[PDB]
Structure formats: structure tokens, C-alpha cells
Structure 1
Amino acid sequence: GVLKIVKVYLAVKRRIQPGDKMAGRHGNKGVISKINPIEDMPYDENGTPV
């Protein structure tokens, strides 16, 4: 009882967002709270922000 079936494949590019569940390999899991601008990041003497 069907005529024809149309399958449409949608590719979603989900960027990292506040709330996305990010977790390391050692059981440390956390939700991203804020996407802090790079100028606000702690930088070492070399200037590379973490």
C-alpha cells in the first residue's frame, strides 16, 4: 500500500556550541559553558592562548 518512497539526506554541520558535551579519555566530562573570545584566554610568556 505505498506508491513511492523518497529519501532525502540532509548534511548538518553542527559546530561546537555552549552546552555541547565534551569529555576526555579519563572520565572527565563537562558541558561547554561559554565560547570565550581568544583575547580573554590565559596566555603564557610565549603568548599562545590555552
Structure 2
Amino acid sequence: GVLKIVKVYLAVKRRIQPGDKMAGRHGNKGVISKINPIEDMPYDENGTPV
């Protein structure tokens, strides 16, 4: 009882967002709270922000 079936494949590019569940390999899991601008990041003497 069907005529024809149309399958449409949608590719979603989900960027990292506040709330996305990010977790390391050692059981440390956390939700991203804020996407802090790079100028606000702690930088070492070399200037590379973490």
C-alpha cells in the first residue's frame, strides 16, 4: 500500500556550541559553558592562548 518512497539526506554541520558535551579519555566530562573570545584566554610568556 505505498506508491513511492523518497529519501532525502540532509548534511548538518553542527559546530561546537555552549552546552555541547565534551569529555576526555579519563572520565572527565563537562558541558561547554561559554565560547570565550581568544583575547580573554590565559596566555603564557610565549603568548599562545590555552
TM range (shorter): over 0.9
Deviation at 1:10, TM superposition (A): 0.0
What TM-score do you get using the length of structure 1 for normalisation?
Answer: 1.00
Q: For 1:3 and 1:36, locate their aligned partners in 2 and report how far apart those are by CA, in whole Å.
A: 52
Q: Which runs of 5+ in 2 are unaligned?
A: none
In the TM superposition, structure 1's runs of 4+ consecutive aligned residues that sit over 6 Å from their partners are none
Aligned length: 50
Deviations 1:3-43 (A, max 9, x none): 00000000000000000000000000000000000000000
Q: For 1:22 and 1:7, locate their aligned partners in 2 and report how far apart those are by CA, in whole Å.
A: 32
Q: Percent sequence identity over matched residues?
A: 100
